[PDB]
Structure formats: C-alpha cells, structure tokens
Amino acid sequence: DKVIDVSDFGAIKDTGSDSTHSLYKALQEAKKIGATKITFPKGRYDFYEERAADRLMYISNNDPGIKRITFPLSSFNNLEIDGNNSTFIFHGGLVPFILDESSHIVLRNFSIDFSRAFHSEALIAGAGKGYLDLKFTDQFPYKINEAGILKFQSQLFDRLKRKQISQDEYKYEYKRVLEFNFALREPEYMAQDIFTGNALRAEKLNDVVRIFHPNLKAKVGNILVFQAKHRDYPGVVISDSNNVELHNITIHHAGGMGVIAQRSHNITIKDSKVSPSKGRIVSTTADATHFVNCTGKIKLIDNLFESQKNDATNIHGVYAAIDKIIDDKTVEIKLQHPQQFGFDFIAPEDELELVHGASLITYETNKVVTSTRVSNEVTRVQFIKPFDSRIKEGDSVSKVRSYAEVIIKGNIIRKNRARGMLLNSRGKTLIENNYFHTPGSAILFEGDANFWFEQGGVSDVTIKNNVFENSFYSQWGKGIIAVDAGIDDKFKETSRYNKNIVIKGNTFKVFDKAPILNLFSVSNLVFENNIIEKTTEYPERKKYNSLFVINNSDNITISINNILQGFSEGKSQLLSPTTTYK
Amino acid sequence: DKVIDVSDFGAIKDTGSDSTHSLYKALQEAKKIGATKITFPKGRYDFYEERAADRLMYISNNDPGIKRITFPLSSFNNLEIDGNNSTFIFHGGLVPFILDESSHIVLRNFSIDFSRAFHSEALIAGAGKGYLDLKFTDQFPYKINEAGILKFQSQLFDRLKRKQISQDEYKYEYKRVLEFNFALREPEYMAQDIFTGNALRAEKLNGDVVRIFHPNLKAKVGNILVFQAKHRDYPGVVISDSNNVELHNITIHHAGGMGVIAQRSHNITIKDSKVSPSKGRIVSTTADATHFVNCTGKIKLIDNLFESQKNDATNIHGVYAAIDKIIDDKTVEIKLQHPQQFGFDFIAPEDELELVHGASLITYETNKVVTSTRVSNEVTRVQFIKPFDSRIKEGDSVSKVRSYAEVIIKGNIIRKNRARGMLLNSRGKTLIENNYFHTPGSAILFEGDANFWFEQGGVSDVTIKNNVFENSFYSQWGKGIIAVDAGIDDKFKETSRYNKNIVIKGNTFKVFDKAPILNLFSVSNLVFENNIIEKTTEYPERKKYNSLFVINNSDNITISINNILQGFSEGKSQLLSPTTTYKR
Ligand SMILES: OC[C@H]1O[C@H](O[C@@H]2[C@@H](O)[C@H](O)O[C@H](CO)[C@@H]2O)[C@H](O)[C@@H](O)[C@H]1O
Ligand SMILES: OC[C@H]1O[C@H](O[C@@H]2[C@@H](O)[C@H](O)O[C@H](CO)[C@@H]2O)[C@H](O)[C@@H](O)[C@H]1O
Ligand SMILES: [Ca+2]
Ligand SMILES: [Cl-]
Ligand SMILES: [Cl-]
Ligand SMILES: [Cl-]
Ligand SMILES: [Cl-]
Ligand SMILES: [Cl-]
Ligand SMILES: [Cl-]
Ligand SMILES: [Cl-]
Q1: Which among B239, B245, B233, B298 has a CA at the least distance from the CA of B264?
Q2: Range of the structural domain that residue A530 is part of
Q3: Contact B50 A378 (CB under 8 A)
Q4: Closest CA to B237 of B290, B169, B298
Q5: Which residue has the least CA distance to atom 21 on ligand 2?
Q6: CA within 20 to 30 Å of A179's CA: A75, A218, A483, B320, which one?
Q7: Strand, coil or helix: what is A224?
Q8: Is residue B390 one of the residues assigned to a domain?
Q9: Residue ranges with CB less than 5 Å from ion ligand 9
C-alpha cells in the first residue's frame, strides 16, 4: 500500500529464522509501487549471510571489498523504515544498511546488534611480567590451536561446517588490546593501546587463559578489550545519497563505524544511541559517526555515543596527494590511506584547492576541466589554466565543497576510546549543550596531508554551553580542546589552518593542570564566560602545569570574564598562556 | 594499424618502471581499430598495483574479491598478444590476465613471475623435538614481531610506507608446511602436509637462522621446507565466460593460486608452455597448474611442462549445487557450498539440470529450467518445467547438463608437484596420450563429490594411451597410481556406476612397490591391456601394499592377460589377479 508491513512478505518476528529474503521482497515491492513506509511488527528479527545481496563497496575510512547487505537501499526514494522498536540481530559478516544513491530515507525505531561481536573482551584475573591471565565469557568463543595461538571464533564446533567456521576466523582477528576500568566502564586512566598483532601466544592454565606479550600491562579486575583488526561491516553506510534521517536508532555493535557517510547531503541523527548490549563493555569497534566530503546540514541531536573504540564523530574532507606532474596543466592524483582507496570525488568543473603538504597552506584554487579515473588509487586531472609553479609532487589537492553546516547539540560523549569530536569542518559549526567525558581530547582540530590525508581547517566554530567533565584523562590528544593538524614546526608561524572559534558558556571540570586549550596556527579565538572547576576524579599528572598552551597564533583572547573554582592559584597564573606544558 | 607496438604507447623495456598504464592505452587502441596483434619489444617489463584496473571477480576454486588486473581483457576479440619472449614481473597483489567475455585470444611468448612469491621457502638447517631451524634467502623477507610470531613480508623496510607494507602481510600468510627433498626437488617421499595455521611461534637464534616451534613439525635436515600460501587471490591467467583462447610458449613461474583457471568457457588450448619455478625457488604456482570449471568444446593441453606447483597439474570438472530449499513440487533454491565456489552463476532458463542423490552421486532425472533468479553469491532460486522426482530431498544436488568438454591431453610432463597429476572429472570424450607422470599423489584420479568440494565428475569415455607412469603415487595423496575416490558412500558403491567406459592401454608403469596401479570402485566397463609394468627400487617399499589391482563394486572390468610384467618375483597370474583390499 502506502505503508508496507514486512510480515505480509514472510518476515516473522521472534522465530530466529532468517528474514533477509522476505525483507528484500518487501523492499522491491515498495520501490515498485512507490510506497512511503515499511514497518516491522515489534519483535526480534534475525538476518544471516546466505541470502543477502552482494555488492562491491568502497567505504571511506573503512575496509573495502565484497559486502553482504541486509538492507540494500540502492536508488531508493521517499521511503521510511519504522521498526516499532524491534531488535535486529545480524549473524556473521553483514553490513546492516547501505544507502547508495538514495534520497529522503528515514530509519526509525530499531536496534542493531551482531550475534557475536567482532572485537573480544575478557576479565583480567591475573597479571605478571609479560603476561595476563584472562577469563572469557561464553559470548566470546575462542580456541588455542596446536601452534599455541589465541584465535577467536564465530562459534564453537562436519568437514564443510569446519571449513565455514575456519573461514570466519578472519572476521574476529585482533591487532591491539586496551584496558578498561571495571567500575567506570571506560578506558583505564592513562592506559594506552598495546599493539600485539593478530597472533598472541596463549595457553589454558591447567577456565583461565594466559596470553603472552612483553608489553602487556593492566590492573587485575579490569576488562581487556581485543580491538578488531578490520572495519568490514559498518552499521549504516550513507553513500552518494541525500536527505537522510536516523531517529531512535540504537547501534549496539558494528564491524567498524556505527554510521559512515561519504559524499552525501543533509544528514540527521537524532534521539539515537551507540551503546553496548548485555555482557559487553564496548559498543562499535570504530567511530560512532563519521562524515567524509559531506555537504548541507549535518545534525547530531540528543544522541548518546558511548563505549565505542574510537571517536564519537569526525567531519572532514579528502586530501589526495599529487603523485605525478605531467604537463603544466595536467596532474595525476593518488589516494594515500588504504581505507581511502576507491574514493572518487574529482569531477569536471569542480574547484580544487592546491595545498602545500608540510604547511597545509593553499597555493591557489584551480578548476578541473577533465577527470579520468585510472584505478582505485590514481585519477588523472587536467586544469583549466596552468597551476601554481610552486606545486611539487607530494603536495595534495582537495575539493572545494559547500562545506557541511555542522549542528551538534544535546549529545552525551563518554566511555569511548580516543577523542570526542574531530572538528575538521570548514563550514559553519555549532557545538552546543553537549556532555564530554573522554580519555582523549574532547574536541580536536586535526587533519593532515602526510598520513590520514583528511582535509580539515575550520573557519566558523561556536563551542557554547557544553560540559567537559574530567576529559582528556589519558593520552589520545594534547588537551581537552586541542589542535593537532599536520603542520611542520617550521611552518606553524606561517600557516593559519583554523580560524574564528568562539568558546563561551562552557563548564570545564578538570582534575589536574592539563591544557584546556592547546592551540597552534589558530587565528581569532575567544575564550570567555566559561567556568573552570577543579576536581579530584583522577590522580594529577605532573607532566602538565598550564591550562592554556598557545603557540604560533594570533588574536587569541583568554578573557578576564572566566570563572575558576577550587584552585589554589589565581587567574594571574592559571589564565596566562604558555608555550609549553610547563 | 593491424599490429600495435606497445612501446609506441610508452611501455619501455629494461627500465624497472611501471608499464601498466602504457599497456592499458595500447589495449584500448587495439579494441578501437580492431587490431589483431599487440607486440612487446623483447625485454623485461614491470607492472605495479598503483594504476591497475580494479574489478570485482568471482574466480571458481580461488579467492573472490577486488582484483587489480594488469591485462584486463574484458570483451576483447580476435587479438593476439606476442611478448617476443619478454619477461613480465608483477609487483604485489596483481592478477596478470583476466579474460572476461572475450573471444579468439592468443597469448604467446612471455613469462609471468612476481617480485616476491606468495609462498615461502627455507633450507632446514636443524631439527629437534617440536621445532625446526630454517635459513631464508633474501627473496623471502620475513619479520618476527614482539609477540614472537613469524610473519612473511613483501619487503624489508616513513609512517605511510610502514602502513602499506603492514597491509601486505595478508598476501603472504601461510597455513601449512610441506617438506621437499633437496636433491630431487620434489615433495619428500611419503611426507604429508603439516598444518600450522597462519601464526607460528618463532625466534631468531643468536640472526640468520630462524627457529619455528610446533609440536607436529617433522622434517629432514638439509631438505627444504615450503610454507603454503593461505590464499588464492592472484591466479596467473583467468579465462571466464570466454571462448577460443590459446596459450603458446607461456611460462608461468608463479601465481597467487592457480596458473590458469578457466570457468564457463569454450575451446581452450595450452601448448608448448610451462609452469616451473624461477631462480632460487623450488615451487612454482601456489595451487593448480591448470583448472577448468564447467568448460565446453575442446580443452587441449599439448607438449607442456607442469612441475613444482603446490597442487594438481589439471582438474576438469563441473559444479554441483546443493538443493538448499524446496519451495514447491517445481521450485527449489540451490546454494553454492564451497567458499571458493560462491558467485558461480551458471543456471539459466532452458538449461537442463541433473538432479542427483547426494550420498550416492546417482542421478534421479534431468529437468529443464524455466525460471532462474539470483538471490545472493550463494543462493539461486530455480523453477522447473515439470514437477521433479518425488525422491529428491533438500541436501541433494543439481548439476548443469552441458556439452561436456572433449579433453585432449598429449605430450605433457607432470612432476615434482604437490598432490595429484590429473583429476579426470570430465564426462566428455577424454584422451590422455603420451604424457609423463611422476607425482607423489595419484597420477590420475577420478574424484568428484556432493558433500564438500561439490565438483561434478563421472567419466563416460576415457582413453589413457601410451603414457609413462614412473614411480608415481610415492606419497599419500590418493589411493594408487590410477584411482577412483568419488564421494560415494559405501552404502551405495554397489549400485552406483559413476565412471564408465575407460580404456588403459599401451602405457608403461614403472613402480617401486606393490601399491595399486588401479584402485577402482563404482566403475563399469574398463579394459586394462597391452601395458608394461616394470619393478623399480627408486623409493623404499611400503609394506601395507600388496596388490597392483584393487577393485570393488564394479562390473565388466578386464585386467587382460596380454599385459607384461618385468622384474617381479611372483607369477604373472597372481600379479594380475584383482583384490578387494590393499593386501590379503
Ligand atoms: O585521526 C584520523 C583517524 O581517526 C580515527 O582513528 C585513529 C586510529 O586509527 C588510531 O589507531 O588511533 C587514533 C587515536 O590516537 C584514531 O582513533 C578514525 O577511525 C580514522 O578513520 C581516521 O579518521
Ligand atoms: O579435490 C578437489 C580440490 O583439489 C585441489 O586442492 C586440494 C587441496 O585444497 C587439499 O588441501 O588437498 C588436496 C589433495 O589431498 C588438493 O590438493 C584444488 O585446488 C581444489 O580447488 C579442489 O579442486
Ligand atoms: Ca562469452
Ligand atoms: Cl554563552
Ligand atoms: Cl592550583
Ligand atoms: Cl604542545
Ligand atoms: Cl614541558
Ligand atoms: Cl645462528
Ligand atoms: Cl602393514
Ligand atoms: Cl602364471
């Protein structure tokens, strides 16, 4: 009809049977008659791999390859999916949602989770030099092979069944471990990622598994998280689509990012949450949300982003390195980071910034006349006029876009690994009424043209009426609000990558003298009407003795109109900037 | 015009520079004007990943996914590629050739190799309880991380460069090891695969010697240990949905998987070519030398050398698809079973399908398809013109009735490889003539099953004539020199007749013990005549074998009196009398 009921196509709740193909037929009928809504009777729905559509997908900042997709929303328009607060359980390697060249899509009232997490967790029962003793719950199946290696499994165990289980070992490969505080259910204070690779020596003590690595260190009683090595199955992919809304969507887990958007226009996530399911301390294995080369309005409103293994959000562009200079008008650009391969974005009549790599200073803006994709890495680009004579190979290009207007309000950011928000948004950005409790920098202006190759550089930011409670209590960043753009030291005085930032009306609850602001190459920033409250939530770090570290900047104002409470010193010292951590 | 010189498009020999993009433009020009030949000035040409065309590919019996292709021959026609005996070096994860919906393609006069093999080799310098001491040459770079695990690298080592190299580790993952005899450069006598997984505990002694730890490690000092590549991502030449393809004087030194893999293709010829290791290596391709899946017309392997590969020299078979769901009396959903079979679409309307009982490989009936709908890379819904056999159950399998390929395999040399020689799963007219076999596994194996590999076999017209089987089946990959191992349960061996009409004549069998020359079951009409059987002492005799002919559940089998046996102690009457067991 106008509204389609999935149960009319065979998708039946609370049975544990695969509803993938019944859902697919309901989707095709909705496209056939132009139905405006698809609804689920409230219940549990399970989705498996065997009948899910297969498509080749390049997904920015995630792993490319063949994807089995449960909701293949390719070229859909004016469609709402209302789950009625149903529970969606995905079995194996599945991408729940991919929105590809779709328009006006509303996802509403359901939860996403996987039958077995791609990461793994264990209770730390013992510890010593070069080892940890671990106890695994049943929902993290594993085995120790004859080589003495710990390998997590999709399930415990004929020959063809064993072969299928053997092929699933890739999905649950680890690469590092991170210790989580048991009581606070957050990354352990000042703990760092401990790299291990995908092969840890292990042996069962003769229910306790002992793992061996010379860099292992953790507190007994805490939770050890095995970080998933891959990002193959993000929760919701928004690709080349527009006007997408997520309302009351719970993403309990994903093989990578919860929501990843690329080259998409107008995206809203509201009243949703990324939070672990029962028996887990971690939600998604990568960023909660992420936006690449997106335009229009990006709205994160009244969400809860917690316990994921990476940043809550990152809104940025793509830098493509200048690999080959052919003639004075033609260049061949190359995508650099492996998870950026296959990102096509340079089209004829586009305007490109021609940026110096080590400085992030734009030489000029040139217009593209022709574009030719050679591979998933290299694209040949010819300009309308000869480009700047100073451009060398190793510099980078970036697309001049109608940069996304960022509206991030009412969100809770806590318990996650790494940073809170990477504000690489050059458009008008508003960060209002958010709560931060992150081990890394609550807010970070990053971007570089040497590794990540992410285009950042703000020009209109307002950070107002937020609460920063005991954030940056570890080492993922350089302060509560910090700049860490990829600018060489010899260019910091010359470059001005981030401009026009207002930080007002916020409350900073801090436990030591870590930098509240750590800025370089910033032009025009005002810090006024904020409250700085001293706490004793974590042990004080002797590394830091300055709340405001400022270098190679101009027009920075740490106004007298700021209230400080609980400190022994006064504004004369604590509000005076330094060049070092002091 | 008619002949395009690739150097006219910037492909320069003997420079080490990437010629991928120059070659691509020469290919597009040949298609634009209908050129008939592309020539390479004789020299060395290097191809890299950075500018290779990317396509999704499903390659049967190999690993699917994104492929970077150096020669993307998609919808090319009447084109010859003459390398003039050039050397093509491929750096990293590249598929050298993919022929997709192409016709009348001839490849001749060049060699294919990779700058670093996907497998690894080492000299065994020492041994002890639960370990092996290994010495790796410079062309097999490796790392031992802080976890103490051996991880082979694309090269020895900037932050971005370290990330690129680290991502290459997946390409060189291992899963098992095999011992090779140093002097004879073959799998060690009676040695078997030793499973390890992709993670071996290792430590560098003092450096230069690496000690690997595993309780099942066992090998002779002085021999060579081969680390089997875990993946089959980069086969040498892929022939997919194409027709009339010829390979002449093609040297495939290495591949990430199979040398030549053909699927759903008509008329293929491989002549005067060879699969053999490059300098400093004991192994060539990491999987089958040649392989043909659902192929039709004529398959010709003429005067080739297939040696040192980690699998069979050839396998010519069809695809069994299991009946996963019965919708109604006319409608089923079939499912591809083996992971390296996913994405193999082959059922179309008007196709006729065999409907086969799984455990017996006995065909209930043939039925014609009216409707076909691909659901995933595993499941396809099929509707038939008439209600199918009432005895058909979920778990049985279907197979496409095809104009099964006529197989002509003449003048080849098959030796030094792992596993078997030729898997004769070809139901079409098959001729095996004037070949030389020296395989650790069965020289000729009739296999097929509908429970794991899901490969359709079952011959109907085989002539094995004037071949030389010298000291073959000297290890354990099979059940004899010429053996059947079709997936037929013992319950049904007596009523199932999967292989029919086989003639084995004029051959010379040089054997070192009394392992079975023929090990047959479920065979009807076989004649073994005019053969010469000669006793050797090349390998130690195996006491568990005491019968040259082991025959069970068969009919019309003739081990004729006109065969000749030399060098044995027992009488001719006793040596030609078949048994049901390996001994008595
Ligand atoms: O900074 C850009 C980068 O951030 C996220 O990931 C990295 C992670 O890969 C690394 O190991 O740690 C840092 C924290 O120190 C970040 O978490 C994004 O997932 C990634 O796509 C990229 O955007
Ligand atoms: O038998 C069918 C099968 O044969 C080949 O490989 C297998 C190999 O995977 C296994 O480990 O050992 C056997 C020998 O005992 C064969 O070498 C083909 O590569 C495979 O595609 C399939 O056709
Ligand atoms: Ca064709
Ligand atoms: Cl305010
Ligand atoms: Cl103080
Ligand atoms: Cl600093
Ligand atoms: Cl300092
Ligand atoms: Cl040594
Ligand atoms: Cl015995
Ligand atoms: Cl006699």
Answers
A1: B239
A2: 404-574
A3: yes
A4: B290
A5: B61
A6: A483
A7: strand
A8: yes
A9: B 543-544
